């Protein structure tokens, strides 16, 4: 790290920068603030979840390619949802939702798991044990599951926006391989119920 430990994090929030924590404000104006990264912005079109998902789709430092793929992706998501709205009826138009950000968030929240499987070595054979997962770990697991299913190589000539849009719509409507593998994780935890006493923490 090129920063000394006295350099602290910069925070960017207009609701915090418009006005208890008065001594917090004084200590913050007396301490050293490090520079802001390129990915974060003061804008409010942005989503931290979306930015992290781009950074995970990134390969080789091609942020332009990762961004362009997500560009085409929820572009296609919005297009197909508008097609559903135009081809729908009155009540179907009333119930359908076409905001790609909300669809992305709800797909991830439906995709995230609630329990996890950790290997623990009792005796000489490994036992997969259920474990409570932290929220950061389960969100990372959901996003990595979606990316691996997109890059499963079984899609042949399909393009990445098409893959991710199709899997995203399935995940929002609570189908697809990502929901299937979350259910399979819960299935295997159900298989090994009673090993949960092997945890020491």
């Amino acid at each position: 790290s090129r920063y000394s430990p006295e350099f602290k994090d910069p925070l960017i929030d207009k609701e915090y920068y418009r006005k208890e924590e008065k001594y917090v404000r004084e200590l913050k104006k007396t301490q050293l603030i490090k520079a802001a990264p390129a990915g974060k912005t003061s804008s409010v079109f942005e989503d931290p979840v979306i930015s992290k998902f781009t950074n995970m789709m990134m390969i080789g430092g091609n942020k332009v390619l990762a961004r362009s793929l997500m560009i085409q992706t929820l572009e296609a998501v919005k297009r197909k949802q508008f097609e559903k709205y135009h081809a729908a009826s009155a009540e179907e138009q009333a119930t359908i939702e076409r905001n790609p950000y909300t669809i992305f968030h709800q797909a991830l929240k439906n995709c995230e798991p609630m329990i996890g499987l950790v290997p623990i070595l009792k005796g000489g054979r490994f036992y997969q044990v259920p474990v409570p997962l932290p929220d950061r770990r389960r969100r990372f697991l959901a996003m990595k599951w979606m990316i691996t299913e997109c890059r499963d190589k079984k899609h042949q000539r399909t393009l990445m926006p098409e893959k991710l849009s199709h899997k995203l719509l399935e995940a929002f409507h609570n189908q697809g391989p990502v929901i299937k593998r979350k259910h399979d994780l819960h299935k295997m935890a159900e298989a090994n119920r009673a090993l949960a006493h092997y945890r020491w923490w």
């Binding site: 090129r2 910069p10 603030i33 490090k34 520079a35 390129a38 912005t41 804008s43």
Partner: protein, 304 residues
């Protein structure tokens, strides 16, 4: 010591010669002039400033030799001689007595500084006990002799003020008011000029920002300070940039606008924007490859 005496005499005669040597037959030749003169006379070229030539008086050159603690009859002078730490233990005795008579009436020095003042080697726990004793005296309501005692043991703080240096607003060109700032990030130099009004107009290297920056990430990077300070469509920047890549150039340009909009914004908002982290250079630069490796920190194969 006679060594110190004849060295002081030699230093006086030598500095007299040295002032006569350079230009300064007047008696008043000061220490910084002595250093400048010897620097010219013997051009150092050595990276260590203590390995550079020096002309000081033998008090500063030679260390502090402690005087003889006993005369020509034995009979050492201080009553706490046989402790071997007479100055430290006499100080402890005096502070303890001052606490005792105070009770019957009713930043800090570092260990090396106390060692310099006592001319005695000291332990960390001894220094800690001394500091706790003086803290007890400070917490006790004490008189003025006690206060000046604490203050001759206490030293300065040398606090730093961290308000962002506001560049002046130069009223120039035809009739317009501007500030010219600079920015640097990852071998890219960007100097920018912002005029107060113009409703938002960017002139990177003579062309516009949608031409020099086809990437929406770079355009967002340009937006960032104006969107933080809520003065988006109000100003105009003309900037010239050398070196780097697209993101390094965008970051350097951004630092330049932040460090000129500091002049064009109020002081509370510029402290807020410094807290947001726009007025500090990003020191993260490319590291070096090393012999026997495969990159900056990446190594080769099997080692274990």
């Amino acid at each position: 010591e006679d060594f110190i005496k004849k060295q002081i005499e030699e230093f006086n005669i030598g500095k007299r010669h040295l002032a006569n040597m350079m230009g300064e037959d007047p008696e008043t030749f000061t220490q910084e002039d002595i250093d400048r003169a010897i620097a010219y006379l013997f051009p150092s070229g050595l990276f260590e400033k203590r390995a550079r030539p020096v002309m000081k008086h033998p008090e500063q050159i030679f260390p502090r030799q402690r005087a003889i603690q006993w005369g020509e009859d034995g009979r050492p002078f201080h009553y706490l001689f046989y402790t071997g730490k007479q100055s430290y233990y006499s100080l402890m005795h005096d502070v303890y007595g001052m606490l005792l008579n105070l009770e019957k009436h009713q930043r800090w020095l570092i260990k090396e500084e106390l060692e310099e003042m006592l001319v005695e080697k000291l332990s960390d726990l001894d220094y800690m006990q001394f500091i706790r004793l003086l803290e007890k005296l400070l917490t006790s309501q004490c008189g003025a002799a006690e206060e000046e005692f604490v203050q001759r043991f206490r030293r300065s703080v040398t606090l730093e003020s961290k308000k962002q240096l506001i560049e002046p607003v130069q009223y120039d060109e035809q009739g317009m008011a501007f500030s010219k700032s600079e920015g640097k990030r990852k071998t890219a130099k960007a100097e920018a000029i912002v005029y107060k009004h113009g409703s938002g107009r960017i002139k990177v290297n003579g062309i516009d920002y949608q031409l020099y920056f086809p990437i929406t990430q770079d355009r967002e990077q340009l937006m960032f300070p104006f969107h933080f300070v809520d003065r988006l469509g109000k100003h105009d920047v003309t900037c010239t940039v050398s070196g780097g890549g697209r993101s390094a150039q965008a970051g350097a340009i951004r630092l330049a606008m932040a460090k000129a909009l500091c002049s064009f914004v109020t002081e509370d908002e510029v402290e807020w924007m410094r807290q947001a982290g726009l007025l500090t250079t990003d020191p993260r630069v490319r590291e070096r490859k090393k012999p026997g490796q495969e990159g900056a920190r990446r190594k080769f194969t099997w080692k274990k």
